[PDB]
Amino acid sequence: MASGYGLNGGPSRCFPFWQELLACYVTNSSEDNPDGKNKCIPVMEDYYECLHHRKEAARVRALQAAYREAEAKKLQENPPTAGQIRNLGLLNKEEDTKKVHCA
Amino acid sequence: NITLILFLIGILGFVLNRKNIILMLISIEIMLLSITFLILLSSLNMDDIIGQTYAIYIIVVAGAESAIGLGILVAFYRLRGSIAIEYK
Amino acid sequence: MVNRILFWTGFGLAVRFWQLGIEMRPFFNRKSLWAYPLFGGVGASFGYWLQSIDEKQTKMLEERKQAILEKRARRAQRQAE
Amino acid sequence: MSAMSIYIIFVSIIAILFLAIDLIFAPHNPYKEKLSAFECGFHSFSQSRSPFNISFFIYGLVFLLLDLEILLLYPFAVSEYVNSAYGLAAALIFIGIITIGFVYELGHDALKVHSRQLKSSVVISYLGNI
Amino acid sequence: MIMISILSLLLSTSVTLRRDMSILFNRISIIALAYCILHDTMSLSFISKGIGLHGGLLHITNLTQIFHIFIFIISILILQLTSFYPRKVWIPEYSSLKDIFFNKILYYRTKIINKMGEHMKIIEYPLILLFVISGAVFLISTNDLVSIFLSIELQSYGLYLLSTIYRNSELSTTGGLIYFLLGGLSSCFILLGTSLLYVNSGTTSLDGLYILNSISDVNSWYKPYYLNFSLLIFSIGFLFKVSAAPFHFWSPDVYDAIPTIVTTFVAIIAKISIFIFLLELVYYTNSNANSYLSEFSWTYALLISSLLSLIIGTVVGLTQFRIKRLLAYSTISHVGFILLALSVSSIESTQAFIFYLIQYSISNLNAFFILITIGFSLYGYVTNNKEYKSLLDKNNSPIQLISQLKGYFYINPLLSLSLAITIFSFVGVPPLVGFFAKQMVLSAALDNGYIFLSLIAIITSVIGAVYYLNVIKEIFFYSPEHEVNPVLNESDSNFSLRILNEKNVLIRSVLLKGRNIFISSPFSITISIITNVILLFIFMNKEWLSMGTILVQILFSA
Amino acid sequence: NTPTQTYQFPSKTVKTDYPLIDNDPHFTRVIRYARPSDYAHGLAAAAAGPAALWLMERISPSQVGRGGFAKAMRLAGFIGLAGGFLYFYQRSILRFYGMSENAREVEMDMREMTDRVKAGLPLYGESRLSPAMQGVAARQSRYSALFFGVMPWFNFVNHNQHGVDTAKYYQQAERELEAERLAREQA
C-alpha cells in the first residue's frame, strides 16, 4: 500500500506504484500548467490495479473460460497422474518426467 | 461482507435497544469491532502494516471509551438508581 | 479622523467606564482615578502594537497584489504566442 | 491434519466423554429440597439477581486501561534491535506518561478499600475562687 | 507546552486531595496557556500553505497557528470563572495603588465570595479542560486519517468528562450520559468515514488523498466515487458535534442540563476546532472543473445542514422559555451561517467564514459571561415566584428562565445594556459586529449564485429576531420580580472590615453593608471589553479584517 | 573530497525572509548560536509565570490553607522555567530556520562548517543510529520548533539531512585551501 511498510518487515508491494504516482505529479503538475497532471492518469490507474486487482481479475476470467473450453473440447490421450506430477524433476524417475512433459 | 453485517447489528443494537445503557455501550463496541475488522482485512490484501497499526489504536481508544462510559454510567446510576431505559 | 492611537486610548477609558457601570460603582471616585490613565495607557499600548501589525499587513497585501498582477500579466503573454 | 486441530478435538471429546458417562451411569433422582439453593440449611431471601455493591470496581476501570498500556509495550520487546536508542526514547516517553496517571491513582487512594469497625481537645483551666 | 503543562499540573494534582487548591490550579492553567500563546506567536514568521511535521502526521499553517492562539485566548477567558471568586467587597478606603499593593483587608469572606462553591472545589477541572484544548489544537494540525480519529476522541472524551465532572448533580450526570452516548455514535460515523478512505485508497495521508482527488479531476475501472461519499459519512459525524441540524437534538438538552460555567467552554471550543479542520478539507477536495464527481460532492451535506440549521434554529427557538435552551438554538442558527460560508468555497466566503467564526465565539462568550454574572448579582436580591422556587440545581444554573431576567434593567442597567448589545449583535443589526459578519457571508453567497440560500437566511433571521427581542422585552419592558434582600440592607447588621499595612499593623477598621458587595473585576472588565468591541467595531475593523484577507490569499495562492 | 552530490534527500521549501542555515539543527548548535538576548528574554519569560501568580495572590487572594500557595509556586515556578526555556530555544532556532534576522548565525555557520570540511570530519557529525533511523529522526524534527506551543521536540541525532545544499561549504573551503597553499609558497 502507500506507506512503504509491509507485513514481513519488508516494503509494501504497492509502494513502487505509489512513489511513481507521487513522482509523476510533482514533476508534471505546476502552477504554470494545470494540465500536466493528466500525464498522471495511467500512473493512477496502475496504483489502483496493484491495490484492488479488478483488471487482472477480468483478464484471468476471460482467459480461464477460453482455456477450459479449449482443453475440454481438445482430444484427450492420457492423463498424467498426481504421482507422476509429484515425480517431476527427481533423481531416479526419468520415465515419469518424460511422460509428464510428453517429450 | 461480515463487516457490514456486524456494523448493522451494532447500529441497530444501539438505536433499536429498549433494555439498558450497558447494552447501548456494548453496541458501540460491536460497531468499532466491525470497522477494525474491515481495516484488518484490507491491510492484509494491500501488504500494509499501517492498517494493523491503525487497528491496534482503535482497540486502545475503544477501551478508553468503554472505561469513560462505565465511569459515567456509575455516576448516573448512583443518582438515578436505574440504568434501564424507559419506554411508556 | 480615526487615529489608531487616539481611538485605543479612548477605548481603554470606556472599558473602565463600562466596568464601573456594570459593577454599579461610582465613576470618578477620587482615590481610584489612577485607573483611567492605566486603562487608557494600556489601550494606547495596544494601539502602538496594532499600528505595527498594520504596517506588516499593508506590505503583505502589497506584495500579493503585485504577485497577482505578475501571475496574470505573464499568463496572457504566453497566450499571444 | 495439524497437531493443533486434533489437540482441540481431543480435549473437547474428553470434556464430552467424562460428561457423557456421568449423564448416563449415575442415578438421577431430582426432588424439591435436593434442588434448592444452599444456604447452610436454612432457606433465605433469593437476592442474587438484584444489584450488588462492588467495592473494587474502580480497580476494574483502571485494569482496563493498564492492559492496553502493557499490550502497546509488547511490539517494542520483540523489535528492540531495530528500535535501538531512537525507538527506546519514544517507548520511555510513552511509559512515563502512563506512569504519571498511575501516580495519580496511588496519590488519590483510588486503589483503596476503606474498612474497619482522634484524641481529646478540650482543656479545662482552674482559676479557683472568684 | 500544552503537554508539559498537562503533565506538570497532573503531578501536582496527584499528590493532593485539598479542595482549596482548585482556585490556584486554575490560576496556573491561565499562566500555562499564556506560554502557549508566546510560542505560537513566535512560530508565525513564514508564508506557506502547509509544512508537514513529525513524520507527516501533523502539519502547521498560518491558519493553523492563528487558530491555536485564538483557542488559547478563549480558554484563558473561560478559565477566569474558576480562577477568581464571583463577588467582592470594595471601599474607597482601599482603592489606591499603595492600598492594593501594600495593604491588606481582613473580613469574613467565606459567604460573600462563595469560597466553598462547587466551581471552586473541583481539583481536576482545569486539567480536563487542558486535555480538551490539547485535543482541539492537535485536530487543527492533523494531516493523517489516524491522527484525525485520535484527536477528535481526545477532544470529545474530555467534553464528556467535563459534562459529568459535577458528579453530585443528577442533571449533569444525565447531560453527560446523553452526550457520551450520542457522541459515541458520532465517532462511529467518523471512524467509518476514515476507514473507507484508507481501504479504497491504500493511504492514511490526507496529502495523498488530495493528490488522488486532483488527478481524478479531468473534465474507467476505478472511478473515485469513494472520496465524496466516504467524506459524507465522515462529515455527518462532525455535524453532530457542531450541533448542525438535523443532528442537533442533543445540544439543547445537554447545554441546559450541565452547569453554566461548564456550558460556556463546552458550547464554544468544539466549534472553532472542528470548523477550521473542515475548511482545509473543503478547499483541497473541490473539483474546479465540473465533473461526475462534482455532482456527488460531500459538501452538499453542508448546504443541506446549513439550510436545515437556519429553519430549525430560529423556529424552535420561538417557544423556548429556558435561557440555556434558547442560547443553544441561537447557536444552531449561527452554525447555519457558518456552514453556508463553508460550503460556498471562494476567497470572499473564506474571509467571511473566518471572520464569522471568531466574532461569534467572542459574542457567544459574552452572552455566557453576562448570564453567569447576572446570576451572581442576585445574591443581595430576593424573589417570591413559585416557578423560581420550583427550579432544579439552582446552584449550578442560577439563571434558568428568560422570565428570571424580567426587569433586570432596573436592577443593573449597564449589564442589561451589555446583554442587549450582544443580543442585538446576534440579530445582525448595524453597526454592531454581528451585522458585519452576517453581511460578509451574504455578500459572498450572492456573488457565487447561492441566491436561494441567501433568501432563506434573511427570512430566517427575522424569525430568529423574534425570540431575541422577547429576551430584551423581558429585560427592559417590565418590572423586577427580584427585591433587595431586606436584612442585607437593614442598617442594623454590618460586618467589620479592617485594613492593615505592609507589616501586620492595623490602619483603619470599617463597618460594611450589602451595598459594599460588587461583581469581581475580572468578569466586569471582560464583559466591558467584548461589549465595546461589538459596539465600536466600525472604528477598529482594519487589522482584524486584513488578518483574514491574508490567510485566504495564502490558502488560495500558488 | 567533493561528494559530487549535495542534496541527497527531498526537503520542504518555505517562503521565509532570511537565509536557511539548517531546518533540523542539533540541540548543541541552538544553544551555542543563541545570542545574549536569548538568555535575557527566556529568563524574563521564566520569571513571568510565578510573578504572575504572585501578583494575582497580592491583588486577589485565593484564601488557600497554610501551605497551599508554596505548593502552587513550585508548579508555577516549573511551568515558567519550562515555558521560558522553550522560548529561548525557539528564538535561536528561528535564526537557523531563516525565520528571524540571522546575519551573525550565517557567518558563524559558514566558518564552523568550512572548518569541518578542511578537517575532513562530517559536517553534521557521526551517528550511532542506522542511516534509515537518521531519516526518521530528521523527518520527525525538521521545522519542529514551530509546534513548541503544543508538543516540544529537540534534535539529539547527528544526521546529514538538514535541508541545505552543502556545496557552498565545500566550494568555500577549497578556496581557503587554495589561498593557504599559495601563502605557504611565498615563505
Residue E418 C-alpha, separation from nearest chain B C-alpha, in angstroms: 38
Which domains, and CATH codes, for chain B? 1-80 (1.10.287.3510)
**Does D119 fall in a domain?**
no
**Does D73 fall in a domain?**
yes
Cβ neighbours of D104 in E, within 8 Å: 10, 13-14
With contact defined as 3+ CB pairs under 8 Å, the chains touching F are D, E
**Amino acid letter for position D111:** L
Longest distance between any two alpha carbons in chain B, whole Å: 52
Residue E97 C-alpha, separation from nearest chain F C-alpha, in angstroms: 10
Q: How many residues does chain B have?
A: 88
Buried b vs exposed e over B22-34: b needs ≥16 C-beta within 10 Å?
eebbbbbbbbbbb
Q: Does residue E377 contact residue E412 with C-beta atoms inside 8 Å?
A: yes
Q: What is the H or E stretch that residue F52 is in?
A: helix F36-59
Residue E55 C-alpha, separation from nearest chain A C-alpha, in angstroms: 12
Cβ neighbours of E13 in D, within 8 Å: 104
- Residue found by looking up cell 569541518 in the block: F116
Buried b vs exposed e over E278-300: b needs ≥16 C-beta within 10 Å?
bbbbbbbbebeeeeebeeebbbe
- The radius of gyration computed from the CA coordinates of chain D, to the nearest angstrom, equals 30
CA–CA separation, D59 vs B67, rounded Å? 11
Sign of the dihedral through C-alpha D87, F89, F150, E357 = negative
Distance of CA E315 to CAs E53, E250, E326, E464, Å? Answer: 45, 17, 11, 7
Domain count, chain D: 1
**Does D71 fall in a domain?**
yes
**In a 3-state reduction of DSSP, which class is residue A61?**
helix
Measured between CA atoms, the residue of chain B closest to residue E172 is B76
Closest residue to D72, CB basis, from B60, B67, B71: B60
In this complex, do E14 and D97 lie within 8 Å of one another by their Cβ atoms?
Answer: no
Q: At what resolution in Å was this solved?
A: 2.8
In this complex, do E174 and B58 lie within 8 Å of one another by their Cβ atoms?
Answer: no
**Does D88 fall in a domain?**
yes
Distance of CA E373 to CAs E80, E177, E466, Å? Answer: 12, 28, 25
Which of E264, D65, E165 is CA-nearest to residue B72? Answer: E165
Q: Does residue E448 contact residue E349 with C-beta atoms inside 8 Å?
A: yes
Closest residue to F86, CB basis, from E1, E54, E84: E1
Q: Does residue E422 contact residue E370 with C-beta atoms inside 8 Å?
A: yes
Q: Does residue E74 contact residue E109 with C-beta atoms inside 8 Å?
A: no
Which of E125, E69, E163, E226 is CA-nearest to residue E551? Answer: E69
CA–CA separation, E465 vs E481, rounded Å? 25
Distance of CA C60 to CAs C57, E11, E296, E545, F57, Å? Answer: 5, 45, 37, 14, 43
Measured between CA atoms, the residue of chain E closest to residue B4 is E192
CA–CA separation, F10 vs A26, rounded Å? 11
CA–CA separation, E215 vs E222, rounded Å? 13
Beta bridge partners of E495: E512
**Does D101 fall in a domain?**
yes
In the numeric block, which cell numbers belong to residue E441? 457571508
Cβ neighbours of E222 in A, within 8 Å: 45, 48-49, 52, 54
In this complex, do B32 and E177 lie within 8 Å of one another by their Cβ atoms?
Answer: no
In this complex, do B56 and D72 lie within 8 Å of one another by their Cβ atoms?
Answer: yes
Q: Does residue E28 contact residue F72 with C-beta atoms inside 8 Å?
A: yes
- Whether C and F touch (3+ CB pairs < 8 Å), yes or no: no
Measured between CA atoms, the residue of chain D closest to residue B58 is D68
In this complex, do E24 and F90 lie within 8 Å of one another by their Cβ atoms?
Answer: no
Which of E91, E88, E80, E92 is CA-nearest to residue E33? Answer: E80
Say yes or no: E14 contacts chain D, CB-CB below 8 A.
yes
Distance of CA A60 to CAs A13, A42, A57, A63, E220, Å? Answer: 20, 21, 5, 5, 18
**Does D113 fall in a domain?**
no
CA–CA separation, E519 vs E525, rounded Å? 10
Q: Does residue E490 contact residue E52 with C-beta atoms inside 8 Å?
A: no
Q: Using an 8 Å CB-CB cutoff, list residues of chain A that contact chain B.
A: 1-3, 5-7, 12-14, 51
Given phi > 0 = left and psi -120 to 50 = alpha, else beta, which region is F61? beta
In the numeric block, which cell numbers belong to residue E348? 470572499
H-helix segments, chain D: 3-25, 57-71, 74-77, 80-107
Cβ neighbours of E10 in D, within 8 Å: 100-101, 104
Which of E120, E129, E112, E28 is CA-nearest to residue E78? Answer: E129
Helices (H) and strands (E) in chain A, counts: 5, 0
**Does D78 fall in a domain?**
yes
CA–CA separation, E347 vs E443, rounded Å? 12
Say yes or no: E195 contacts chain A, CB-CB below 8 A.
no
In this complex, do D108 and E14 lie within 8 Å of one another by their Cβ atoms?
Answer: yes
**CB neighbours (10 Å) of residue A44?**
21
**Does D129 fall in a domain?**
no
**CB neighbours (10 Å) of residue F116?**
16
In this complex, do B69 and E184 lie within 8 Å of one another by their Cβ atoms?
Answer: yes
- On the 0-12 / 13-18 / 19+ scale of CB atoms within 10 A, E510 is middle
Q: What's the domain range around D14?
A: 3-108
User: The domain spanning residue D8 has which CATH number?
Assistant: 1.20.58.1610
